[PDB]
Design a protein around this ligand. Structure first.
Ligand SMILES: CCCCC/C=C/C/C=C\CCCCCCCC(=O)O[C@H](COC(=O)CCCCCCCCCCCCCCC)COP(=O)(O)OCC[N+](C)(C)C
Ligand SMILES: CCCCC/C=C/C/C=C\CCCCCCCC(=O)O[C@H](COC(=O)CCCCCCCCCCCCCCC)COP(=O)(O)OCC[N+](C)(C)C
Ligand SMILES: CCCCC/C=C/C/C=C\CCCCCCCC(=O)O[C@H](COC(=O)CCCCCCCCCCCCCCC)COP(=O)(O)OCC[N+](C)(C)C
Ligand SMILES: CCCCC/C=C/C/C=C\CCCCCCCC(=O)O[C@H](COC(=O)CCCCCCCCCCCCCCC)COP(=O)(O)OCC[N+](C)(C)C
Ligand SMILES: CCCCC/C=C/C/C=C\CCCCCCCC(=O)O[C@H](COC(=O)CCCCCCCCCCCCCCC)COP(=O)(O)OCC[N+](C)(C)C
Ligand SMILES: CCCCC/C=C/C/C=C\CCCCCCCC(=O)O[C@H](COC(=O)CCCCCCCCCCCCCCC)COP(=O)(O)OCC[N+](C)(C)C
Ligand SMILES: *C/C=C(C)/C=C/C=C(C)/C=C/C1=C(C)CCCC1(C)C
Ligand SMILES: *C/C=C(C)/C=C/C=C(C)/C=C/C1=C(C)CCCC1(C)C
Ligand SMILES: *C/C=C(C)/C=C/C=C(C)/C=C/C1=C(C)CCCC1(C)C
Ligand SMILES: CCCCCCCCCCCCCCCC(=O)O
Ligand SMILES: CCCCCCCCCCCCCCCC(=O)O
Ligand SMILES: CCCCCCCCCCCCCCCC(=O)O
Ligand SMILES: CCCCCCCCCCCCCCCC(=O)O
Ligand SMILES: CCCCCCCCCCCCCCCC(=O)O
Ligand SMILES: CCCCCCCCCCCCCCCC(=O)O
Ligand SMILES: CCCCCCCCCCCCCCCC(=O)O
Ligand SMILES: CCCCCCCCCCCCCCCC(=O)O
Ligand SMILES: CCCCCCCCCCCCCCCC(=O)O
Ligand SMILES: CCCCCCCCCCCCCCCC(=O)O
Ligand SMILES: CCCCCCCCCCCCCCCC(=O)O
Ligand SMILES: CCCCCCCCCCCCCCCC(=O)O
Ligand SMILES: CCCCCCCCCCCCCCCC(=O)O
Ligand SMILES: CCCCCCCCCCCCCCCC(=O)O
Lengths: 255, 255, 255
């Protein structure tokens, strides 16, 4: 991909590769670290009290928050190696925008859906999956059909966002107030930050032209830290509060 | 992919791109529309009587018919954008024949297998998956090993077709006559149309040479409409008849 | 991929393609054959006595050993067609080292994990998946970041190997001595041979330079025969011994 004489001067690929490499490297360590904390604490037991799991194992699906973090962090390690190697390398996760997200965003929606017991888990998964594929297509397409792909993207996303809103709202009163606190912050992230991604696309170098490819890399690093690690920690703490109420103390869910 | 001077005149890629774009666009709307009807009716309740689901949710796997339709329709939107953009675009679902089917055909077999309660669901899934990958390989390979890939394809498909025949036949008498009617039409499609795909490959421009790449695109649009939408509607109506008998009226399956 | 004038003389791709084709072809037949035996015997019933399954079906997950074999054998058929066609063909499973393993190795770990009832099945799956992706990246990367990808690979693999060791050791005394015999050989393969793959990478033409690309193809054919077929047969016989004890004879697991 990289011209043997380096990227052209005025090229969108004429970036500060050392800085980009560095930023991915730190993001790699914090996101992966958060995942290790998540799996560790999950194994410790149920609730803050750390009541022993009857089976001696946590439920399989509780592992998704941590796994998503370890997977996102591993991709940030790859992304770093590409930047430090100057970009345009044979195995570049920095070349096809959104391809990495095809793997992590559908897992995030499942994690949220198992944690709250939302209906229509298969639908939510495919809604998210198709949305990210439209993004990928949108980014590689140089014609105006760029915006045909983007719109097709928005067609999937909008009914997904509104459906999820209604479903979370229905379950938000089932949980006790202590649980309700963590659920609030996770909703802020989901409904605050997920819309940021398509709004950013419009102002990028592929739309209006306000945001450079370099700034775009740095911004997605902050967004990935928030949408994976912090969200992950919020799901973990939400599940600890929930277990303390229902399992350690034996109380019942409003429902 | 597209030469800057357009496709050569005698080229297999010298096609009526406006017509192809148009045809994919209509197929996109009908297939996606059918899927929306499928998920809507599923949510309404069990049977024609629309008896409330006890849990308040349909079973997850009942969503596959509709999902398959929404996924196939979304790919027909992509295929349209590629044709209208003249073909050979960076994100072309019209370039690698059969790649799209790698995602939808294994889902169709699961849908049919959950609906009838066939054995060996994991086997059926991988049988179908491998068959379509052989097709993909067959299409990109320009040598005579084209027919080595095709044969390897047929090796997977033939024992799958015969195994399924036997398994459907065993379950066809379990169901009441009203159900038996819909099951018949779905079998016609599965055993009539699925064989059409490999028979078409032989007469294509990659075999004998009777069918042009353009005609081939138009024919697969009709086959996708039949194998996804109509099949989908037949599964839906079959499940409505079945639920009316077993759930609303409480009758028992012959079995 | 292949220069129209053939591969250069001193090229790593100047190989004995007839011999390579031949070797893949035999490996294809034995691995696929073993899989057919595996599914056949599974269908026969529970234990050596072949006690009828109550449901009339084997459990779905017992099919994985055979499926993995049929999938690996099918890829060896593809690999053969590529070698006989001289290499560098459009659908070459011989071009991107380790890509094929991305599909089979995570399935092997699930098969082993369902058979022994190991905890953390989702974690084990993703540990293996990410490791093989690091291999793929390592192989295509020509820079020294080759060894950054390899190390990242080893970061996933090492905690996986040690975790599995501890978990198998905990379950190895649950099973009766007759079962314990087969479990021993399967552990030899898993802990003997899986480490062979990264040790080979170091001595290859991409590391020190002791092992040629040709020898490397032949060695992986022997390793795939051992890690898929023989392992597969060991899992099958282990499950037959186990069922004879617990199901046919009704005895209890130490646990
Ligand atoms: C930052 C997000 C804010 C969440 C704070 C939740 C909180 O308040 O934490 C409390 C304790 O949670 C707990 O066990 C612990 C909560 C924090 C979990 C620790 C985060 C680990 C970060 C690892 C990064 C390492 C990088 C190398 C919950 O009861 P107050
Ligand atoms: C794409 C959709 C992904 C998730 C769809 C889903 O799971 O939502 C189902 C359909 O609701 C819905 O789409 C209804 C809400 C979203 C559709 C709104 C369209 C406005 C444009 C929920 O049905 P209920 O449980 O109410 O019965
Ligand atoms: C065409 C296939 C033939 C199937 C007809 C089944 C039938 O006979 O439909 C009846 C009613 O089914 C039902 O609820 C409804 C059956 C038909 C379902 C409606 C199809 C929706 C098409 C959406 C396309 C919109 C494009 C934008 C079944 O009891 P008779
Ligand atoms: C590829 C196979 C995909 C599905 C295989 C499967 O699920 O079929 C199983 C094997 O039957 C079979 O292949 C037997 C029928 C298909 C094989 C016929 C080979 C003829 C050439 C069914 O076993 P049963 O329930 O009778 O015990
Ligand atoms: C070689 C691995 C060694 C395992 C031998 C296990 C053994 O000892 O086999 C015995 C019987 O197992 C059984 O039913 C049969 C055990 C062997 C299974 C037969 C292997 C089939 C190979 C198919 C390859 C065909 C290629 C075309 C187990 O009780 P002893
Ligand atoms: C990557 C990890 C894949 C599998 C991880 C897993 O499933 O292992 C869990 C964590 O143990 C572990 O990693 C502990 C053993 C592996 C970590 C050792 C690190 C040394 C370097 C097991 O937890 P327990 O059941 O003891 O509670
Ligand atoms: C961890 C990364 C996350 C949560 C990413 C989410 C990304 C989106 C919600 C992206 C949405 C898009 C559209 C709605 C349409 C156009 C293309 C996208 C991918 C930017
Ligand atoms: C919705 C699309 C469907 C149901 C497609 C099915 C396609 C096949 C059954 C194709 C079969 C093939 C072979 C049996 C061998 C050669 C290659 C194929 C893919 C044409
Ligand atoms: C059937 C094939 C099997 C069991 C292959 C297993 C392969 C590995 C365990 C490979 C391991 C690697 C590393 C630990 C790091 C570097 C890259 C690999 C893929 C060679
Ligand atoms: C929905 C409307 C936005 C799509 C814009 C792309 C137009 C496609 C035609 C380009 C010539
Ligand atoms: C109570 C703390 C809430 C967590 C922080 C909210 C998420 C936004 C981070 C940027
Ligand atoms: C929904 C469809 C969105 C299409 C318009 C996006 C913004 C276009 C930016 C200007 C391009 C010059
Ligand atoms: C979200 C953060 C707001 C976007 C940052 C502005 C882009 C900076 C200019 C890059 C050229
Ligand atoms: C927090 C958001 C980070 C903003 C990134 C802007 C960098 C511009 C070069
Ligand atoms: C099964 C027979 C059909 C395969 C035909 C391809 C032959 C491969 C050799 C080409 C030279
Ligand atoms: C009773 C109606 C049956 C449905 C139609 C059969 C499928 C063939 C369509 C072309
Ligand atoms: C089963 C193997 C099928 C191989 C033959 C397919 C038809 C070949 C068409 C003629 C090619 C000139
Ligand atoms: C199934 C429909 C039958 C095939 C159609 C014949 C192909 C038309 C000729 C294209 C050149
Ligand atoms: C119904 C089948 C459609 C036949 C397509 C033939 C088109 C030839 C140009
Ligand atoms: C862990 C250490 C091994 C990694 C070796 C690759 C070094 C990357 C820098 C190359 C210049
Ligand atoms: C763990 C990191 C391994 C890095 C070193 C691998 C061997 C390098 C081979 C010599 C290369 C000339
Ligand atoms: C495992 C087998 C040991 C490796 C074989 C040595 C490589 C032969 C030399 C190739 C040039
Ligand atoms: C058994 C291992 C096979 C060794 C392969 C070495 C081949 C060298 C040419």
């Amino acid at each position: 991909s990289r011209p043997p004489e380096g990227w052209p001067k005025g090229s969108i690929n004429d970036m500060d590769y050392p800085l980009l490499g560095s930023i991915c490297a730190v993001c790699c360590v914090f996101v992966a670290g958060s995942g290790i904390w998540m799996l560790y604490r999950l194994d410790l037991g149920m609730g803050y009290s750390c009541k022993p799991y009857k089976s001696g194992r946590a439920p399989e699906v509780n592992s998704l928050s941590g796994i998503i973090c370890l997977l996102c962090g591993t991709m940030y390690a790859a992304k770093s190696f590409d930047f430090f190697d100057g970009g345009g390398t044979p195995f570049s996760l920095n070349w096809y925008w959104y391809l990495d997200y095809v793997f992590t965003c559908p897992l995030l929606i499942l994690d949220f859906a198992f944690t709250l017991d939302l209906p229509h888990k298969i639908r939510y998964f495919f809604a998210v999956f198709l949305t990210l594929w439209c993004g990928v297509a949108a980014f590689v397409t140089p014609s105006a059909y760029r915006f045909a792909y983007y719109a097709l993207g928005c067609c999937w996303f909008t009914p997904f966002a509104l459906s999820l809103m209604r479903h979370v709202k229905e379950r938000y009163l089932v949980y006790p107030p202590k649980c309700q606190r963590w659920l609030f912050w996770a909703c802020v992230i989901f409904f605050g930050f997920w819309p940021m991604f398509p709004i950013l696309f419009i102002f990028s170098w592929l739309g209006t032209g306000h945001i450079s490819q370099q700034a775009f890399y740095i911004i997605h690093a902050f967004l990935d830290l928030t949408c994976k690690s912090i969200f992950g920690i919020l799901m973990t703490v939400f599940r600890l509060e929930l277990e303390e109420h229902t399992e350690v103390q034996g109380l019942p869910l409003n429902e």
